[PDB]
Design a protein around this nucleic acid. Structure first.
Ligand SMILES: [K+]
Ligand SMILES: [K+]
Ligand SMILES: [K+]
Ligand SMILES: [K+]
Ligand SMILES: [K+]
Ligand SMILES: [K+]
Ligand SMILES: [K+]
Ligand SMILES: [K+]
Ligand SMILES: [K+]
Ligand SMILES: [K+]
Ligand SMILES: [K+]
Ligand SMILES: [K+]
Ligand SMILES: [K+]
Ligand SMILES: [K+]
Ligand SMILES: [K+]
Ligand SMILES: [K+]
Ligand SMILES: [K+]
Ligand SMILES: [Mg+2]
Ligand SMILES: [Mg+2]
Ligand SMILES: [Mg+2]
Ligand SMILES: [Mg+2]
Ligand SMILES: [Mg+2]
Ligand SMILES: [Mg+2]
Ligand SMILES: [Mg+2]
Ligand SMILES: [Mg+2]
Ligand SMILES: [Mg+2]
Ligand SMILES: [Mg+2]
Ligand SMILES: [Mg+2]
Ligand SMILES: [Mg+2]
Ligand SMILES: [Mg+2]
Ligand SMILES: [Mg+2]
Ligand SMILES: [Mg+2]
Ligand SMILES: [Mg+2]
Ligand SMILES: [Mg+2]
Ligand SMILES: [Mg+2]
Ligand SMILES: [Mg+2]
Ligand SMILES: [Mg+2]
Ligand SMILES: [Mg+2]
Ligand SMILES: [Mg+2]
Ligand SMILES: [Mg+2]
Ligand SMILES: [Mg+2]
Ligand SMILES: [Mg+2]
Ligand SMILES: [Mg+2]
Ligand SMILES: [Mg+2]
Ligand SMILES: [Mg+2]
Ligand SMILES: [Mg+2]
Ligand SMILES: [Mg+2]
Ligand SMILES: [Mg+2]
Ligand SMILES: [Mg+2]
Ligand SMILES: [Mg+2]
Ligand SMILES: [Mg+2]
Ligand SMILES: [Mg+2]
Ligand SMILES: [Mg+2]
Ligand SMILES: [Mg+2]
Ligand SMILES: [Mg+2]
Ligand SMILES: [Mg+2]
Ligand SMILES: [Mg+2]
Ligand SMILES: [Mg+2]
Ligand SMILES: [Mg+2]
Ligand SMILES: [Mg+2]
Ligand SMILES: [Mg+2]
Ligand SMILES: [Mg+2]
Ligand SMILES: [Mg+2]
Ligand SMILES: [Mg+2]
Ligand SMILES: [Mg+2]
Ligand SMILES: [Mg+2]
Ligand SMILES: [Mg+2]
Ligand SMILES: [Mg+2]
Ligand SMILES: [Mg+2]
Ligand SMILES: [Mg+2]
Lengths: 76, 95, 283, 46
RNA sequence: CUUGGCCGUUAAAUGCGGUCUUGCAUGAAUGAUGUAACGAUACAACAGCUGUCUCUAUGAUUGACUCAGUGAAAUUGGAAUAACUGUGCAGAUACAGUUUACCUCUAGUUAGACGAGAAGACCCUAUGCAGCUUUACUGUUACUAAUUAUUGAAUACGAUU
RNA sequence: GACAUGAGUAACAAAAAAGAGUUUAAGGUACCUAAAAGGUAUCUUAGAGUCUCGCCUAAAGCUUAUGGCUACGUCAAGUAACGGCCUCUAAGUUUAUAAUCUGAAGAUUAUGACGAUGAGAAAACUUUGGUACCAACAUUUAAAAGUGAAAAUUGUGCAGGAAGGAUAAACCGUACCUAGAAUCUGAAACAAGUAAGCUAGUAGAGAAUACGAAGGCGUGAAUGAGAUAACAAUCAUAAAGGAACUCGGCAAACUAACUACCGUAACUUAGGGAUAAGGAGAGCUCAUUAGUCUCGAACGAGUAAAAAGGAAGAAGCAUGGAAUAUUGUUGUACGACUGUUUAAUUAAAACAAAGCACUUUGCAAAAAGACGAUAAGUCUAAGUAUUGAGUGUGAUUUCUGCCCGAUGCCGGCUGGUUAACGAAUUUUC
RNA sequence: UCUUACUAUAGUCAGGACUAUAAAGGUCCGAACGGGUUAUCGUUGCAAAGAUAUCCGAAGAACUAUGGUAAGCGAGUGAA
RNA sequence: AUGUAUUAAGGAGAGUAUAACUUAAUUUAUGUUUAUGAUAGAGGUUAUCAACAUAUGAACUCUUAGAGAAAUUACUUAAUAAACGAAGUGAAUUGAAAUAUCUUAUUAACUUCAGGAAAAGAAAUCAAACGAGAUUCUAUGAUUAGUGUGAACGAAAAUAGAGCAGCCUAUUAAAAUAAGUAAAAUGGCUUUAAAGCUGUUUGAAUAUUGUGGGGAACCUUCCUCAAAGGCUAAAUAUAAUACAUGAGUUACAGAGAAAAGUACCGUGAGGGAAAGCUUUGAAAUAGUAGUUUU
């Protein structure tokens, strides 16, 4: 069972609580099973990985810019 | 402790004999030696039917539009016990 | 059985100290001593043991008839191998037949008034020393059970039978207790012949404070050492008694002869009351 | 001054001394709940 | 009273130790008195030892100081905030008179700003409090005594007469 | 509530400590080049690593707890190589039942239930009471020796040392942090505080002292680089003198540990004082060797064996060589003594104490004492006058004198007084 | 959940020395541990009780852990 | 804030189409009117382009079987907050310029029991020589009578209004008309000394053909009522919800809460925030510019 971090009801506001835990089960198969390997970044165009990657960098840089403001700093 | 102490206590926070289940159900009884005897009359099975040749899928073509049923004059249209009994005589009278 | 719990510290069922200066002693076990001795027949003393919750010693006896073992307050001089017997449940058929009569006071005392034998006080002759004297006809021993203590039979309510043989006429007999009080006791009350063992108990010396702590005794703080709020004797600059007559923490006179026995509770069994020293020095 | 009185504090004593069942099962504990419930508290115990 | 008299200790003794007594105001389980042992108790002396001192000096590290980075606090009526003598709610940067001083900082220093802080400390006041004491006033209890009721009798003796 | 002043000041100093290379990602500048790009160098932010040096080291290391505002892919039938849940019970708890007590609330006793800080079969495969017991202390025991546990054996001392039950694999925990370098408590990234096991080696009696193998660290710029004034802190040394300082030898210095070494006073409760005091010795090389051990063949040889060993010898200013153990003696007061106390200004002469003494307690239903809006009832105590309680004194030697008037307590008159009660009386309308 | 006392279940005390004991001592020297004698520093402190040195106890009236009980008309606990 | 109407057990945890609420978290049907409503198309996720009325599937865990460290275990078609009501118990601050009686005060608070309300209630009541005619709520009567040294406390008759209801054959099932009772002494409560309540010890009578209670010490006559047995709606109290009104508030106001009993503080009981919008931009304060002085 994997627990979940305690959080507030509405993010930065609300009472403190804890979501329901997660349960994982590992079964010992009688017959082996091997997963396929993930496609290369150049072969994910069926999922629009190009557009998705741009939006991801914008979000990673936005949380990174907010983490600098949380330290009481600003980008010169 | 200041604030984490005021959170709901969980089994991953203490170990001095604190046990709290996940509502998985009772599958047997405890012994006096510290073991567990599984009562297979309480264990549950999953009745899954053979899906070989089954043609129905969880989706219906959108060309066929969604139209609700109509039972004019009857307030208990779909739940009418008389409609279920009267229709029973027509189709299957034996059982 | 073990002697544990908060009662060892001087607490009652409420959890508050009702007996001061108690707690922290050594772990102990209570011994189930037989203070009634109803079962008849000979009993072989197996060994004299030491009892921590008692000043006198106890004797592990064994009933030769059934083999059951029991504890009894050992007498002064009682050693392993001695055969004690209790004639409280009646005399055996052999002893009665040997006399051939209902009873003979002289013959009986010669065959039953032996050290460690438990008899009704009526059967014990006058002037004999006893150390397990009871009060009621069917009660346990209550007097002179401490180390070195004993009681003497002063008189017996009897009359001459025209043949020089006295016979009990009343229902009680007088006995002088360890405190010097000559009171009245039941005719059928039990008594053990002899003296309680460990006569040199009161001559012991502990030598150090730590030994008293092992005996479950905690320090005793004087009243003069306290403040005016914790004791009628507290207060004052320096050593001062405050011109206050000695009393307890709750106002009970600690000296002068004040008796704590309830007045309405009059002792109807006393023939001669105790002698009051009245504060005069003994030695 | 204040003292570090919560040093070595175990969460087993919190449940025993300030827990929910220490109150529903006592006359004076039912008041605390009813009092805290009338005020609108979410944390009725511990 | 008093640094009591004498003796010993110091070159020098209001101390310390011994001793004598008239002890303002020692004293026998609010114990009296004398030793062994014990003491981070208190006092005094000796030997040794030393920068404790005569009398300080040099050396070491970290701060102090400068540059770069980050960045407080108590405090503050407002200030263009010198010296003297005088004056005055009686101790003047601020009034009177005279004198002196180009403008502005840095490191030191703490004489003053009756410096700051703490209603800290003392005394007094209140028909303000608290705790404690007692032969304060007024009360309640433990406890003691008598007695109706629960509860009916017999005999003897003594006392009033 | 906002914004000033102090002030761009103090502070970022646990006496561990840093130095020089290298490299990854993203981004900012300069040049190359103007086909965009790319390349070279540099800077910023977030990291990683190599060589050297140092600090901790019975920790500032590793493995785990209590705990957690650190983060959620942490995986078990059981043993070796695991806890919980579950069974049993202790101290206790109980709006459970019955009885009893009680202004209500409630309390008491019994039984039941619950309650670990304890007890729970088997496994490298598994499912009666000394004929005793498993508190402390000591001893012995898995046969090559030694050491550390486990369990057991034997014995000692008094302070006399639990309870109960038995005897084909569910559910829950498993991540990280352990306080000198990012996590627990101290308001916090605090020089404080917190449990268990392990915790290289040399050297030792040792967990003392010194060094330190591995490991970790030498903080999130919460800092870094210079300079080395006064003054402060923490230290080091010192001519001659040696308490002349000062309320006072405060602080500092001297001394110090070790040996089966020598020697040791007054006084004493005969135990002590006493490790008194005061002296001697110490490392390195070596002659010498009864046995043990080794080697060769009784004997011979050997310290590339442990030890023993002497008035032997060498070198230096010095061989308790560095570090670790802070003087000795004497006269008094007070308190016998070991202990205890105002957490966080008084550790003491105060408290306690063994001892001593006095008062109280006869247990026949309540021993007294204490507790109980107040009782039943509980502790005392499964005790009995050598018991329990209260009061003062405070080991021991030598002693503890006079006064019962006052005060308190105790005993006592068919006494005096004497409320209620009450013989005999009396009044308003 | 601090602290005082009691209670139940448990745990800890290197090494050495003296004494009648192999083990019988509120014995001795001294770590861990527990105390807090003296001095300095600190005092808007690292710390609303700390640091360094020095000193005391260290088989006991010892120390420590997890639970439990007793406190607010009357006073719980108190080597006071 | 008040008024009016309706109603008569409240919260939490976790989860989910983030207007949609319970693992079915946007169920399935009926009737009517649909722009002269109500108050001749497109659109099923590019959704819910329809309101009213009447039915309907589902609706988890804890509070809440027993246990336990609430949201767990183990079982099972186990289940009810606060405020208000009545009785019992019952203070102190305070005032009297101290302070004891007194006042504060039949108060606060606590305990028990009970319902949507409860309690009370159809005269052993008041009046005064005339008469009224149960209870409850509001006002006057009334800083009155009166008590008390004082300080202060403080009725009733009656009147007005809100409601109006009487009965025992109680519109829900009750009496053979009430004896250890009325009453007395004594110890208290209440209070004006009466009446009423009460522990202890004692202890009556039988109806207007004048028996019993009361009419404020008490006796007497007269008047009035008929205890020791009972039932009864409404006006009233509290809470929730909806609506109406406003010389009520408009963000340090209103409420503690315009996202709140949340965040946060405390071991705990408990304490308890800040925070609106797209408009306007005052002072203080800071760095500069112009003129001017130094
Ligand atoms: K100055
Ligand atoms: K600085
Ligand atoms: K060490
Ligand atoms: K398991
Ligand atoms: K009660
Ligand atoms: K540390
Ligand atoms: K010194
Ligand atoms: K202490
Ligand atoms: K004394
Ligand atoms: K006298
Ligand atoms: K006298
Ligand atoms: K006399
Ligand atoms: K020592
Ligand atoms: K007055
Ligand atoms: K008046
Ligand atoms: K009636
Ligand atoms: K402005
Ligand atoms: Mg954890
Ligand atoms: Mg944990
Ligand atoms: Mg358990
Ligand atoms: Mg005592
Ligand atoms: Mg004593
Ligand atoms: Mg004492
Ligand atoms: Mg005192
Ligand atoms: Mg007193
Ligand atoms: Mg005096
Ligand atoms: Mg405090
Ligand atoms: Mg603790
Ligand atoms: Mg005396
Ligand atoms: Mg700077
Ligand atoms: Mg002047
Ligand atoms: Mg001027
Ligand atoms: Mg200065
Ligand atoms: Mg001025
Ligand atoms: Mg400055
Ligand atoms: Mg400076
Ligand atoms: Mg670049
Ligand atoms: Mg059990
Ligand atoms: Mg356990
Ligand atoms: Mg912290
Ligand atoms: Mg720290
Ligand atoms: Mg570390
Ligand atoms: Mg560094
Ligand atoms: Mg010198
Ligand atoms: Mg010299
Ligand atoms: Mg001098
Ligand atoms: Mg001088
Ligand atoms: Mg030489
Ligand atoms: Mg002493
Ligand atoms: Mg001492
Ligand atoms: Mg102190
Ligand atoms: Mg001190
Ligand atoms: Mg003595
Ligand atoms: Mg008694
Ligand atoms: Mg004395
Ligand atoms: Mg009379
Ligand atoms: Mg010792
Ligand atoms: Mg300073
Ligand atoms: Mg010592
Ligand atoms: Mg349930
Ligand atoms: Mg339940
Ligand atoms: Mg009125
Ligand atoms: Mg009637
Ligand atoms: Mg009456
Ligand atoms: Mg009358
Ligand atoms: Mg009356
Ligand atoms: Mg009447
Ligand atoms: Mg009248
Ligand atoms: Mg507001
Ligand atoms: Mg506005």
């Amino acid at each position: 069972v994997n627990q979940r971090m305690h959080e507030q009801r509405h993010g930065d506001v609300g009472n403190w609580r804890r979501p329901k835990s997660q349960k994982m089960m590992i079964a010992e198969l009688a017959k082996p099973f091997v997963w396929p390997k993930p496609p290369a970044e150049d072969a994910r165009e069926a999922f629009d990985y190009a557009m998705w990657k741009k939006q991801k960098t914008a979000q990673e840089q936005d949380t990174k810019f907010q983490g600098i403001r949380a330290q009481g700093e600003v980008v010169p | 402790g200041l604030k984490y102490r005021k959170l709901r206590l969980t089994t991953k926070d203490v170990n001095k004999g604190f046990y709290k289940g996940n509502r998985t159900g009772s599958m047997g009884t405890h012994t006096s030696y510290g073991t567990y005897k599984i009562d297979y009359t309480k264990v549950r099975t999953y009745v899954c039917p053979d899906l070989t040749g089954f043609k129905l899928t969880p989706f219906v073509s959108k060309t066929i539009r969604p139209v609700h049923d109509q039972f004019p004059g009857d307030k208990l249209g779909p739940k009418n016990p008389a409609t279920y009994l009267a229709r029973w005589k027509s189709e299957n009278g034996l059982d | 059985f073990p002697k544990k719990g908060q009662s060892k510290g001087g607490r009652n069922h409420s959890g508050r100290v009702t007996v001061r200066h108690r707690g922290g002693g050594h772990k102990r076990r209570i011994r189930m001593v037989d203070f009634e001795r109803w079962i008849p027949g000979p009993h072989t003393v197996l060994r004299i043991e030491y009892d921590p919750g008692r000043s006198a010693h106890i004797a592990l006896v064994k009933e030769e008839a059934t083999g059951r073992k029991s504890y009894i307050v050992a007498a002064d001089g009682m050693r392993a191998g001695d055969v004690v017997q209790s004639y409280r449940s009646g005399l055996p058929q052999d002893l009665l037949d040997s006399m051939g009569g209902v009873v003979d006071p002289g013959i009986l005392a010669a065959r039953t008034c032996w050290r460690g034998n438990c008899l009704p006080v009526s059967m014990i002759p006058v002037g004999t020393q006893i150390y397990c004297v009871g009060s009621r006809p069917d009660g346990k021993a209550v007097f002179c059970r401490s180390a070195g203590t004993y009681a003497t039979i002063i008189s017996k309510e009897e009359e001459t039978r025209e043949d020089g043989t006295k016979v009990m006429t009343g229902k009680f007999v007088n006995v002088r207790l360890q405190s010097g009080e000559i009171r009245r006791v039941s005719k059928d009350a039990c008594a053990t012949v002899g003296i309680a063992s460990n006569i040199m108990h009161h001559y012991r010396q502990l030598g150090k404070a730590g030994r008293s702590r092992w005996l479950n005794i905690r320090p005793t703080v004087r009243g003069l050492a306290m403040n005016a709020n914790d004791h009628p004797h507290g207060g004052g600059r320096g050593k001062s008694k405050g011109n206050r007559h000695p009393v307890s923490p709750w106002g009970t006179p600690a000296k002068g002869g004040y008796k704590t026995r309830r007045k309405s509770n009059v002792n109807k069994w006393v023939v001669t009351p105790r002698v009051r020293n009245m504060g005069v020095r003994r030695n | 001054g204040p003292r570090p009185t919560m040093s070595g504090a175990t969460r087993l004593v919190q449940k025993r001394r300030h827990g929910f069942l220490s109150r529903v099962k006592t006359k004076n504990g039912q008041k605390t709940l009813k009092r805290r419930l009338a005020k609108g508290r979410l944390r009725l115990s511990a």
